[PDB]
Amino acid sequence: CPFVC
């Protein structure tokens, strides 16, 4: 992901 995952 961009944010954490």
Give DSSP secondary structure letters for 1-5.
--S--
CA 2 to mean position of chain CA atoms: 4
Half-sphere exposure of 4 (CA within 13 A, CB side): 0
5: Cβ contacts below 8 Å, ≥ 6 apart:
none
Half-sphere exposure of 2 (CA within 13 A, CB side): 0
